[PDB]
Amino acid sequence: YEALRHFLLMEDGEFAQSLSDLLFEKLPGELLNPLVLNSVLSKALQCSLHGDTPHASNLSLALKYLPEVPDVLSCLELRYKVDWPLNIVITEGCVSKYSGVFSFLLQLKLMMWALKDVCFHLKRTAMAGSVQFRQLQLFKHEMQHFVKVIQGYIANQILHVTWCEFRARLALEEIQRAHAEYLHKAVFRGLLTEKAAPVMNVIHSIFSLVLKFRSQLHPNFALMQQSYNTFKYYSHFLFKVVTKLVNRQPHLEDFLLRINFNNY
Amino acid sequence: REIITLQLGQCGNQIGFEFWKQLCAEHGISPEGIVEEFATDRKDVFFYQADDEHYIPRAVLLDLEPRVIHSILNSPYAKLYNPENIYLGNNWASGFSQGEKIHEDIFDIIDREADGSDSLEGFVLCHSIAGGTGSGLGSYLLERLNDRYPKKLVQTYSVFPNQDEDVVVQPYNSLLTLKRLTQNADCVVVLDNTALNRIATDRLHIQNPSFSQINQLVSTIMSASTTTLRYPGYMNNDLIGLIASLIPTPRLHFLMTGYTPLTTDKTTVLDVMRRLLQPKNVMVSTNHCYIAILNIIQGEVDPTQVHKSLQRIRERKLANFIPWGPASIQVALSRKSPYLPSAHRVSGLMMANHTSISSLFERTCRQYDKLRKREAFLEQFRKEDMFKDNFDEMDTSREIVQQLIDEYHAATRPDYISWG
């Protein structure tokens, strides 16, 4: 469990931080052969001094669908397999939900990649001071705080509070039930549930807008100001929609912590 | 990625030696370079992986007219590092001119170390502001480093010279150094001499041997600042990802630090959060308000309690800052190190951007202007003379630091859409 966790909820650092950065240089016509996608995970493992395991074997990176390649959608699975007497406890239905949440967390890493890109693209233009420069960098710092608060919500819920349990929940059927409950709470706190689906609907707008801000590179300052204003409006509307669902969730309460700490 | 350290100035070389000794003790390293018998954790940023797994510290010591380097030389820890990275007046312009003529070979050493490293992330600077020889040469090297490497990061650890007086020309030197630090550095970690001195006189009963204790303090702070990289978690295991949250704007890049135990040789995280928000745990000295606050915790933590603690401290409103926008506190977690005995294992750090240091800078701006107005304190130094016969570089730095204080006070206002 604490082996598969490192790969499918990314508890191994500078493995995710080395996988994602390399993957996003491509995005395609590339990433179709199993010689670069199968080796980039092996490249990510050596930057973290982890591996030489029977968990390192049966690591299969694969796409569930071929790319049709802004587009903020992608598919990517990472699959781990076991043999016969442990197949009955860890099934093919649980690992499917593990690959479901892993894609979600990787797409969250795409955010801190893209804002890092714009930070670097601004770094190469950073000499002489002007108004456009400071008023431009506030967009980057602004979006960086917002991705840090949604990342911190994930960083507390699926990553800390649900991991304290399932360390004595095991103490033959009970193991299957405990594993399924732990995974069910992981997909429950991920807000991929249909009750919390309208919150997830707001997430795509923010994701698309910061990918738009990446695309723009002072040639067109007012365009960037307009996109910034729409971003601020969507973040303002998120505060209302998460407030409305308090009347009709203990796991969402932490969300109300992060998006609401000082300045309405 | 891979970070190289540079150390210059007497106190800077002191804290560099103490820092490397602290990490050798912290990790499974013998003082010969050999891995310990009982050594999982990453040493692949500041320690070159040598032939017998010799974690040779990735450090470059820069000095001129060595005195304390001889004391470094006769040590059992003189075999941990020094793969020959050691290379042998108290004016800013003196150290500037001396660093000017030997810029080439020291830059060659830097390029040698860059070639020796596979990857690169940053040059972290051990600096003493107005330390005499460190002043001027440190600014020169900072300008050179920003010039040659426009793709790397520059972090500066330095103390700010205030001992309530001494030297009549040091505010000029520190002002020029601050001008260089504002323009030629990417992020600055600021320290105060009198504040750390007062804390040392507080928790202990010393008056003279403050250096030997302050080395420990800065070493603990710096190692704490790097622990999540040295002990791998998965939140901000890069320097750049950590620094990105801390800097809200390229004009404000000075970071306030604390340390939750004033002495640590079983309270909960809720208590020490309340302690850390008290300023007696803060080690760097209208309303002054934080822009952005971060904290890092390492200890025996229950993961539900941090959430409810954030709830309660949020509701108690012990965060006496009013921003101009949406910026808030950020939490982080790190691992408690093995092999070190720790009572009250919970230990935390804070990184916050606070405007109050402007007042400290203003103190120097007052002082230098006063000594400029009477004009009996420039003292007519010759290095200062042929470097600048009209001394308009001091006016230039005065212009920059005035703009800096105005940027500070515009950031204090509830809009930063207006500038200062």
Swiss-Prot record, chain A:
The chain holds residues 1517 to 1815 of 1819 of the full protein. It is linked to Microcephaly and chorioretinopathy, autosomal recessive, 1: A syndrome characterized by microcephaly, cognitive impairment, underdeveloped retina and choroid, and epilepsy in some patients. The more anterior parts of the retina, near the periphery and pars plana, have a grayish hue and diminutive vasculature similar to retinopathy of prematurity. Visual impairment becomes evident during the first year of life. Component of the gamma-tubulin ring complex (gTuRC) consisting of TUBGCP2, TUBGCP3, TUBGCP4, TUBGCP5 and TUBGCP6 and gamma-tubulin TUBG1 or TUBG2. TUBGCP2, TUBGCP3, TUBGCP4, TUBGCP5 and TUBGCP6 assemble in a 5:5:2:1:1 stoichiometry; each is associated with a gamma-tubulin, thereby arranging 14 gamma-tubulins in a helical manner. Gamma-tubulin at the first position is blocked by TUBGCP3 at the last position, allowing 13 protafilaments to grow into a microtubule. The gene is TUBGCP6. It is found in: Cytoplasm, Cytoskeleton, Microtubule organizing center, Centrosome. Coiled coil: none annotated. The lineage of its organism: Eukaryota, Metazoa, Chordata, Craniata, Vertebrata. Disulfide bonds: none annotated. It comes from the Eukaryota. It comes from Homo sapiens. This is Gamma-tubulin complex component 6. Belongs to the TUBGCP family. Component of the gamma-tubulin ring complex (gTuRC) which mediates microtubule nucleation. The gTuRC regulates the minus-end nucleation of alpha-beta tubulin heterodimers that grow into microtubule protafilaments, a critical step in centrosome duplication and spindle formation.
Curated annotation (Swiss-Prot), chain B:
Tubulin is the major constituent of microtubules, protein filaments consisting of alpha- and beta-tubulin heterodimers. Gamma-tubulin is a key component of the gamma-tubulin ring complex (gTuRC) which mediates microtubule nucleation. The gTuRC regulates the minus-end nucleation of alpha-beta tubulin heterodimers that grow into microtubule protafilaments, a critical step in centrosome duplication and spindle formation. InterPro entries: Gamma_tubulin, Tub_FtsZ_C, Tubulin, Tubulin/FtsZ-like_C, Tubulin/FtsZ_2-layer-sand-dom, Tubulin/FtsZ_GTPase_sf, Tubulin_C, Tubulin_CS. This is Tubulin gamma-1 chain. GO terms for molecular function: GTP binding; identical protein binding; microtubule nucleator activity; structural constituent of cytoskeleton. The gene is TUBG1. The keyword S-adenosyl-L-methionine does not apply. PROSITE patterns: TUBULIN (PS00227). Phosphorylation at Ser-119 by BRSK1 regulates centrosome duplication, possibly by mediating relocation of gamma-tubulin and its associated proteins from the cytoplasm to the centrosome. Gene3D superfamilies: Helix hairpin bin, Tubulin/FtsZ, C-terminal domain, Tubulin/FtsZ, GTPase domain. GO terms for biological process: cytoplasmic microtubule organization; meiotic spindle organization; microtubule cytoskeleton organization; microtubule nucleation; mitotic cell cycle; mitotic sister chromatid segregation; mitotic spindle organization. GTP binds at residues 130-136. It is found in: Cytoplasm, Cytoskeleton, Microtubule organizing center, Centrosome; Cytoplasm, Cytoskeleton, Spindle. GO terms for cellular component: apical part of cell; cell leading edge; centriole; centrosome; ciliary basal body; condensed nuclear chromosome; cytoplasm; cytoplasmic microtubule. Keywords: Cytoplasm, Cytoskeleton, Disease variant, GTP-binding, Lissencephaly, Microtubule, Nucleotide-binding, Phosphoprotein. Component of the gamma-tubulin ring complex (gTuRC) consisting of TUBGCP2, TUBGCP3, TUBGCP4, TUBGCP5 and TUBGCP6 and gamma-tubulin TUBG1 or TUBG2. TUBGCP2, TUBGCP3, TUBGCP4, TUBGCP5 and TUBGCP6 assemble in a 5:5:2:1:1 stoichiometry; each is associated with a gamma-tubulin, thereby arranging 14 gamma-tubulins in a helical manner. Gamma-tubulin at the first position is blocked by TUBGCP3 at the last position, allowing 13 protafilaments to grow into a microtubule. The keyword NAD does not apply. Belongs to the tubulin family. It is linked to Cortical dysplasia, complex, with other brain malformations 4: A disorder of aberrant neuronal migration and disturbed axonal guidance. Clinical features include early-onset seizures, microcephaly, spastic tetraplegia, and various malformations of cortical development, such as agyria, posterior or frontal pachygyria, thick cortex, and subcortical band heterotopia and thin corpus callosum in some patients. The modification Phosphoserine is found at residue 119.
